[PDB]
């Protein structure tokens, strides 16, 4: 895959995991809305979220924790909320994959003259 391309064929086009992003955030985006978060820093703290957990799906995770606590003892009544939280994380992961792809195509473009 991309690893094969980076290690065997050319590496100029292929990204580097550390470097991304390696281009201005506006090149090709005339308007680039900044990311939004639903939870406040205060709420994310009160829910005792760990630093790694304190991402952009914080609201979904907080909902999950609230409903787990509320459903105790029954621990199987949180499937919908957990699915939604993992779905939010999947969306974030796709956003990061799109960042990777962006950088790849931009480097291919830069390979000019």
């Amino acid at each position: 895959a991309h690893l094969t391309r980076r290690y065997l064929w050319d590496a100029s086009v292929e990204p580097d995991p550390e470097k991304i992003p390696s281009f201005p955030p506006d090149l090709g985006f005339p308007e680039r809305k900044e990311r939004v978060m639903v939870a406040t820093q205060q709420e994310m703290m009160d829910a005792q979220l760990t630093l790694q957990q304190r991402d952009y799906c914080a609201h979904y995770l907080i909902r999950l924790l609230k409903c787990k606590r509320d459903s105790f003892p029954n621990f199987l009544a949180c499937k919908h909320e957990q699915h939604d939280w993992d779905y939010c994380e999947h969306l974030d992961y796709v956003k990061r994959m799109k960042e990777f792809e962006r950088e790849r195509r931009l480097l291919q473009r830069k390979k000019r003259r």
Binding site: V38, E43, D46, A47, Q48, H59, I62, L65, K66, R69
Partner: protein, 94 residues
């Protein structure tokens, strides 16, 4: 190969003696001549519990910082028992 006559005789004699000793080892029917419900629950899970809870409550807790606990989780729409505050809600998402 094979035992010599002396070896065969010796082994037979030692066999007889060995089996006599082994039979000697038997103990007679009188040989071990000995000379002349929740009870467990109450006396091992409750009696110790009284002492231990006495210690905890009336010594450990009474000392400072002995029993420290992490903050209980607080969520939106959650009501604090003591102050009565109601933590505010969450901005809706699309």
């Amino acid at each position: 190969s094979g035992y010599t006559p002396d070896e065969k005789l010796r082994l037979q004699q030692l066999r007889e003696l060995r089996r006599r000793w082994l039979k000697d080892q038997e103990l007679s029917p009188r040989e071990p001549v000995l000379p002349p419900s929740s009870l467990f629950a109450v006396s091992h899970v409750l009696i110790p519990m009284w002492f231990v809870h006495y210690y905890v409550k009336y010594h450990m807790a009474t000392k400072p910082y002995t029993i420290v606990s992490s903050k209980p989780r607080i969520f939106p729409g959650d009501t604090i028992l003591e102050t009565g505050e109601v933590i505010p809600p969450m901005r809706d998402f699309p």
